[PDB]
Amino acid sequence: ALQTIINARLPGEEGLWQIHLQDGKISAIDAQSGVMPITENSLDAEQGLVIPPFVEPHIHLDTTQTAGQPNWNQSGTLFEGIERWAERKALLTHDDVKQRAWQTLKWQIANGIQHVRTHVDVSDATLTALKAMLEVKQEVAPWIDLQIVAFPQEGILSYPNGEALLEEALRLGADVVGAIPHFEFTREYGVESLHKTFALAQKYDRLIDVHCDEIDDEQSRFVETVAALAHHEGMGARVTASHTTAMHSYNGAYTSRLFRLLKMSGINFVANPLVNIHLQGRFDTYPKRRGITRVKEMLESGINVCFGHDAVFDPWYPLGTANMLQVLHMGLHVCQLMGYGQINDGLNLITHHSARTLNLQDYGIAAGNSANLIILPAENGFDALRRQVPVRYSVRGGKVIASTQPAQTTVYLEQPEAIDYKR
């Protein structure tokens, strides 16, 4: 029955703070002028950093843990990945999807992630994975608020009954409408697919998250239609453009023109560093492009951008432990957001910016909000990122739902010495 979080550091704030908890919510936040004593019912942050929970804005829980089944993606490309997934999709069973999704979700809970948006392939007349995921959503609710995107992986207009299946998925309860314009057979189908996606989102009052321009094609500009339709409907807050890796290859003049619309539209952007560095640049010899969208410029322009893990051991990515600080680490390097302040503020890319992408209404350390927060054994964002620290405690509804007793490293010199990699 926790009543207070004491000795907490907060990003962008000086000193220590006390967070009072009442009835599963944050009742008040007060600055401390020194270190407070521990006591029963008090969770001691020990001058560590307290932040709202990590968020996973983009993952594929229906494909997670399937890498190599029945075959491996040899080329390491998005296109072969979809082909390898199609082979696995034909072998799906309800229980298998639930088991694999739950395996990755447990890693996420352990990693302080309390909000997850999973795409689920609905280019499947049986909607096997979707039915399984809707059950997982209910089962995992005490620990993670899971959003499900009805993702038409093989296209809306380019797959048999694609539009009907996408709508069926919404009627079954999917929270977000997906699309993949660059995978449609033609540019015209791509644009038309977006009009259909927006019409469905307005008909059912759902969010939108488009796999948008995930291709090293300087002519893949579906993002301008996503932003324009959102602006026209006055619904930018409910819309997300995932990937936009083609933007890495656009000329600068078009990008500058486009940025005005991106800002005016208010839509969100998701970059997936671990997967993008792996799948993009595969058609270059040397030099080889990085292939991540224009994260640095978006931040400078005040456009909301955040980071997702995208895949965890599946056709598009052979690694991962569903760790957001690891995703952030890769993104900061590839996007060259390596200034001290840029690294320190990096936490926003896996917390607040992602919460905005998911249109969350109860997020942040503020009075009145649910007591959902995590404690990192680090002094600030820079320190947490540099040392790739685990989540010491994850609190949800005012209760501890995960904890990590840190590793203990000792070197035996003339005398034993504890090493914590700090300075």
Ligand X SMILES: O=C1NC=C(F)[C@H](O)N1
User: Site residues (CB under 6 A) for ligand X?
Assistant: 60, 78, 153, 180, 211, 214, 275, 310-311, 316
Burial annotation 182-197 (CB, 10 A radius, 16+ → b, else e):
bbbeeeebbbbbbebb
Task: Tell which residue, 262, 187, 264, 256, has the closest CA to residue 224.
Answer: 262
Q: Which residue is nearest to Fe ion (CB)?
A: 310
Q: Closest separation between CB of residue 47 and ligand X, Å? A: 32
Classify residue 319 as left (phi > 0), alpha (psi -120 to 50) or beta: beta
Tokens 């089962």, residue located: 139
Q: Closest separation between CB of residue 364 and ligand X, Å? A: 28
Task: Tell which residue, 47, 38, 43, has the closest CA to residue 10.
Answer: 47
Q: Closest separation between CB of residue 55 and its own copies, Å? A: 17
Q: Contact, 178 vs 119, CB < 8 A?
A: yes
Q: Closest separation between CB of residue 310 and ligand X, Å? A: 5
Tokens 């005012």, residue located: 398
d(CA 165, CA 160) in angstroms, rounded, equals: 9
Nearer to ligand X, 120 or 262 (CB): 120
Tell whether 58 is in a known binding site: yes
Q: Which of 154, 168, 214, 379 is catalytic?
A: 214
Nearer to Fe ion, 179 or 374 (CB): 179
Tell whether 232 is in a known binding site: no
Tell whether 20 is in a known binding site: no
**Residues within the interface to its own copies (CB under 8 A):** 65, 67-68, 72, 74, 76, 103, 106-107, 109-110, 142-143, 247-250, 252, 255, 274, 277-278, 281-282, 285-291, 294, 313, 318-321, 326, 330, 333-334, 336, 338-340, 343, 385-388, 390, 400-413, 417, 419, 421, 423
Sheet holding 42-44, edge to edge: 25-32, 16-22, 4-8, 42-44
Q: Closest separation between CB of residue 59 and ligand X, Å? A: 8
Nearer to ligand X, 243 or 396 (CB): 243
- If contact means CB under 5 to 8 A according to the sort of partner, which of its own copies, ligand X, Fe ion, none does residue 255 touch? its own copies
Q: Which two tokens stand for residue 142?
A: 């005490």
Report, in angstroms and rounded to the nearest whole number, the Rg of the chain calculated over CA atoms: 22
What's the gap between Cα 227 and its chain centre?
20
The sign of the CA dihedral 157, 161, 167, 172 is negative
- If contact means CB under 5 to 8 A according to the sort of partner, which of ligand X, Fe ion, its own copies, none does residue 320 touch? its own copies
Q: Which residues sit opposite 42 in a β-bridge? A: 4
Which residues in 263-322 contact Fe ion (CB under 5 A)?
A: 310
- If contact means CB under 5 to 8 A according to the sort of partner, which of its own copies, Fe ion, ligand X, none does residue 253 touch? none
d(CA 295, CA 359) in angstroms, rounded, equals: 20
Run of H or E including 251 = none
417 is catalytic: no
Residue stretches of the annotated binding site for Fe(2+): 58, 60, 211, 310
Q: Annotated binding site: which residue ranges?
A: 58, 60, 153, 211, 310, 316
Residues that are catalytic:
214
Binding-site residue numbers for Zn(2+) are: 58, 60, 211, 310
Residues contributing to the site for Fe ion (CB under 5 A): 310
